Amino acid sequence: IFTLRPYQQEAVDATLNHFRRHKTPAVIVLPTGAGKSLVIAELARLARGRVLVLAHVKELVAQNHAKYQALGLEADIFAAGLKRKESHGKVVFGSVQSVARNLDAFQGEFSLLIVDECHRIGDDEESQYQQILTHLTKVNPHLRLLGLTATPFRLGKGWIYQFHYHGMVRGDEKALFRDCIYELPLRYMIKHGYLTPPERLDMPVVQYDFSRLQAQSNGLFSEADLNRELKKQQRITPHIISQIMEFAATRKGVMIFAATVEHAKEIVGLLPAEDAALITGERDVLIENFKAQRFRYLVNVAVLTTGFDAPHVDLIAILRPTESVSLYQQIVGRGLRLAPGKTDCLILDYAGNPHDLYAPEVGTPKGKSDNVPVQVFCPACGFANTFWGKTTADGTLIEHFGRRCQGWFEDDDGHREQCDFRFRFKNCPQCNAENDIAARRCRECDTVLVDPDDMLKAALRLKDALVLRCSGMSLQHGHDEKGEWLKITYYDEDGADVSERFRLQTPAQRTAFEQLFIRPHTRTPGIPLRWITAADILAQQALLRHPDFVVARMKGQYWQVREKVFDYEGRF
Numbered sequence: 110i111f112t113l114r115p116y117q118q119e120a121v122d123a124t125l126n127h128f129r130r131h132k133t134p135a136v137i138v139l140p141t142g143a144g145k146s147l148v149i150a151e152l153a154r155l156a157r158g159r160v161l162v163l164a165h166v167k168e169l170v171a172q173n174h175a176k177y178q179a180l181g182l183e184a185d186i187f188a189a190g191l192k193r194k195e196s197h198g199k200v201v202f203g204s205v206q207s208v209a210r211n212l213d214a215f216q217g218e219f220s221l222l223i224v225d226e227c228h229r230i231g232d233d234e235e236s237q238y239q240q241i242l243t244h245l246t247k248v249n250p251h252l253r254l255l256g257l258t259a260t261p262f263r264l265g266k267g268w269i270y271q272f273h274y275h276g277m278v279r280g281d282e283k284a285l286f287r288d289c290i291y292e293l294p295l296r297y298m299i300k301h302g303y304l305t306p307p308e309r310l311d312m313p314v315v316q317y318d319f320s321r322l323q324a325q326s327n328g329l330f331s332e333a334d335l336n337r338e339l340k341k342q343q344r345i346t347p348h349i350i351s352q353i354m355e356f357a358a359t360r361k362g363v364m365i366f367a368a369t370v371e372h373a374k375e376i377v378g379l380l381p382a383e384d385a386a387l388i389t390g391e392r393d394v395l396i397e398n399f400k401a402q403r404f405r406y407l408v409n410v411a412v413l414t415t416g417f418d419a420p421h422v423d424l425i426a427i428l429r430p431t432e433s434v435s436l437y438q439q440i441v442g443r444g445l446r447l448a449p450g451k452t453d454c455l456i457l458d459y460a461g462n463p464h465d466l467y468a469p470e471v472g473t474p475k476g477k478s479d480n481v482p483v484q485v486f487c488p489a490c491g492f493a494n495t496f497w498g499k500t501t502a503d504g505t506l507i508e509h510f511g512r513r514c515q516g517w518f519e520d521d522d523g524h525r526e527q528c529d530f531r532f533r534f535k536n537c538p539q540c541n542a543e544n545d546i547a548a549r550r551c552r553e554c555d556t557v558l559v560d561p562d563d564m565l566k567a568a569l570r571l572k573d574a575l576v577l578r579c580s581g582m583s584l585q586h587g588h589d590e591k592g593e594w595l596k597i598t599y600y601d602e603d604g605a606d607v608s609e610r611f612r613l614q615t616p617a618q619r620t621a622f623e624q625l626f627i628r629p630h631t632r633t634p635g636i637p638l639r640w641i642t643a644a645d646i647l648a649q650q651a652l653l654r655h656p657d658f659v660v661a662r663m664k665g666q667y668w669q670v671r672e673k674v675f676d677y678e679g680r681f
């Protein structure tokens with residue numbers, strides 16, 4: 110009694126093809142509710158020896174075992190508190206702690222290791238995980254390792270894999286997994302009826318202003334920063350909860366996603382007495398009480414409970430800002446389990462989060478809250494990159510902060526490489542090769558690339574050269590006998606200024622202008638500025654930025670601009 114949905118057969122096929130050509134671990138990205146047990150079952154059926162499904166969380170180990178056996182198949186379990194029964198079946202489910210101390214039971218053939226929730230590996234039970242890995246690779250030197258996760262990306266931690274099979278890089282060489290070989294988007298499950306569809310309320314009455322907040326190192330939000338502005342706007346909290354109650358009269362189950370513990374307890378109070386509970390992050394804490402509708406409301410703070418299956422949840426109310434589209438999708442998905450008569454799950458966002466469940470995950474920290482995902486084509490390979498940026502109403506790009514194309518390619522010989530097109534770069538002083546902005550040594554000639562502070566410090570002390578911190582630039586143009594020209598004047602807050610001039614008459618002059626001024630100064634690298642006359646440059650000065658520092662050699666007529674520091678991070 111097992112036939113595979115098309116997307117499940119695809120995940121199996123992707124795994125077989127990968128390991129028939131490679132030894133390296135790979136990861137599959139599946140959302141909850143996809144039916145991971147069916148993929149495991151068919152992989153085990155085709156396997157030599159046995160298959161081990163390992164998981165850090167013992168609670169998850171027991172669920173996977175349950176769902177697998179519910180397919181009409183047999184398996185062992187190695188979890189704490191359980192006793193070794195008659196070993197039966199081709200699959201073994203276990204936890205990192207239990208397996209790492211019952212390693213004497215794994216002296217047989219294990220051809221495949223499936224690690225569920227593989228995004229946790231860098232967090233906990235790391236010594237024991239190496240213990241399991243060392244033992245399995247000495248018994249099975251050709252063992253294959255498949256990762257499963259619904260959350261490949263975590264803010265502050267990075268991506269779990271480097272190469273995505275659709276043609277883009279996500280992590281760098283430090284990524285735990287070399288490859289993501291299959292991904293099932295949440296959009297596909299909703300579109301094809303594998304999950305209940307969400308329906309977000311378009312116009313909430315009042316919502317929190319969460320734009321002024323500045324993220325910490327991780328890109329996350331501090332509890333204190335969230336609380337500062339929650340208490341600034343706490344006269345809106347009564348009104349938002351009032352409408353949640355109004356919507357809940359037409360719904361069945363209600364989850365509330367609050368920002369802090371201070372915010373939650375306030376929320377529970379405004380809710381009807383005995384009609385609301387709370388989920389921190391002891392036990393089930395009334396998990397099946399909620400599913401028996403002992404209470405209509407269940408508030409939750411930054412704690413995701415693995416395994417929650419509540420088809421009765423008809424309503425999700427998000428009152429916390431979401432730092433990532435991926436976090437928003439894990440929150441929404443908890444109310445998308447199918448049920449008869451459940452036409453949708455109403456989503457009530459009162460935090461000002463964007464209205465796009467299917468937005469692309471940039472995968473890098475935002476920086477400024479007004480930035481949005483923007484699409485930027487690579488001039489070299491044509492890959493459609495997605496960077497942080499800003500647009501007009503029509504969608505016309507104003508700025509984008511991408512630095513390198515994220516595409517990769519692999520040649521017939523099997524050699525793989527990321528696209529080398531660099532939207533932002535620095536030239537090597539010796540060989541002129543284009544290098545990453547952060548590089549300390551040239552990639553082609555290994556010459557030292559001077560830090561911005563050090564070059565400035567030498568010219569700041571040695572005043573034979575001029576140094577100027579730039580607050581902005583002004584543009585001027587005219588027309589002499591050899592043709593048009595454009596003069597740029599760089600100035601500081603105290604009025605000192607350095608100027609440079611570009612002629613614009615000859616083809617070589619125009620080419621040099623684009624090479625030396627536009628492409629460095631442009632706000633949208635990779636999208637050429639269209640221009641005929643110098644006045645066209647002036648009209649489009651919004652698309653240009655000014656350097657943060659200007660260094661000029663105090664020589665020539667008055668000075669000759671030599672260095673320009675863009676995107677400066679350091680002393681000043």
Ligand SMILES: Nc1ncnc2c1ncn2[C@@H]1O[C@H](COP(=O)(O)OP(=O)(O)O)[C@@H](O)[C@H]1O
Nearest residue numbers: 112113114117140141142143144145146147176
């Ligand atoms: N090929 C299939 N045929 C019939 N039912 C399926 C199939 N694949 C998945 N399902 C059903 O879809 C649901 C998957 O939910 P769940 O087991 O929680 O997925 P996961 O374990 O990946 O979170 C289960 O109710 C399961 O019976």
Ligand SMILES: [Mg+2]
Nearest residue numbers: 144145146176
């Ligand atoms: Mg399953």
Ligand SMILES: [Zn+2]
Nearest residue numbers: 487490514528
């Ligand atoms: Zn490219």
Ligand SMILES: [Zn+2]
Nearest residue numbers: 537540551554
């Ligand atoms: Zn060089």
